[PDB]
Amino acid sequence: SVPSQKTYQGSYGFRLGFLHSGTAKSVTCTYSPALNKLFCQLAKTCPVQLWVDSTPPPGTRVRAMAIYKQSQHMTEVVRRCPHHERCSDSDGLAPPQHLIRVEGNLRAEYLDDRNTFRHSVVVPCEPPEVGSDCTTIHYNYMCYSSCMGGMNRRPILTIITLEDSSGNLLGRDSFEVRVCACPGRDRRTEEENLR
């Protein structure tokens, strides 16, 4: 099967938000609204904001999963390459095969779907701190888009779903991701090509 990538705000008005980091050659993570694409360096912090119009019920969670963007590759599970899955860089919670990790959250849970074999990481949906209008999840991508035997230059999408305590869908959003050495230059190049 293939996970749906249809944007759905749902009853709580769920949608993502991204910081405005710019395209300087030294930037480590940058988002392109024009391409709906996040460019980031290997294993660097990717701040993703979660916005809602109303507070979802206690027990609501937020899950992240990667899928290949090209339809001809969509049924293939996105996973770390033969090299990175063996580099012993786990934080003690994320399985070494998982591409997407959540930083600084001891309540993060990593799932290997018994049926689809797909990987995902899910955390409780946190309300904004006093003074804040949204909450942020910090993700890390653990392989380069170019990793041989892994993504192998194929673009991926990250699908973020807001789900209830049973895992039922409450909201969905998504964005393309390119993990590369110079996110700033690549974003500038791709936006120019689009222009």
Annotated binding residues for Zn(2+), written as ranges, equal 81, 84, 143, 147
Pairing assessment for the beta strands 15-17 and 29-32 based on DSSP bridges: unpaired
What is the C-alpha to C-alpha distance for residues 84 and 151, in angstroms, rounded to an integer?
A: 12
> 38 or 81: whose CB is closer to Zn ion?
81
Q: Least distance to Zn ion from the beta carbon of 144, Å?
A: 6
Residue 84: both structure tokens together: 């990175």
Distance of CA 127 to CAs 82, 130, 134, 139, 170, Å?
Answer: 38, 9, 7, 18, 16
Q: Least distance to Zn ion from the beta carbon of 143, Å?
A: 3
> 150 or 171: whose CB is closer to Zn ion?
150
Q: Least distance to Zn ion from the beta carbon of 107, Å?
A: 27
Annotated binding site: 81, 84, 143, 147
What is the C-alpha to C-alpha distance for residues 73 and 67, in angstroms, rounded to an integer?
A: 9
Q: Which residues bind Zn ion (CB under 5 A)?
A: 81, 84, 143, 147, 150
Residue 164: both structure tokens together: 């209830």
CA 87, 93, 95, 100 torsion-angle sign: negative
> 33 or 149: whose CB is closer to Zn ion?
149
> 78 or 170: whose CB is closer to Zn ion?
78
Q: Least distance to Zn ion from the beta carbon of 5, Å?
A: 23
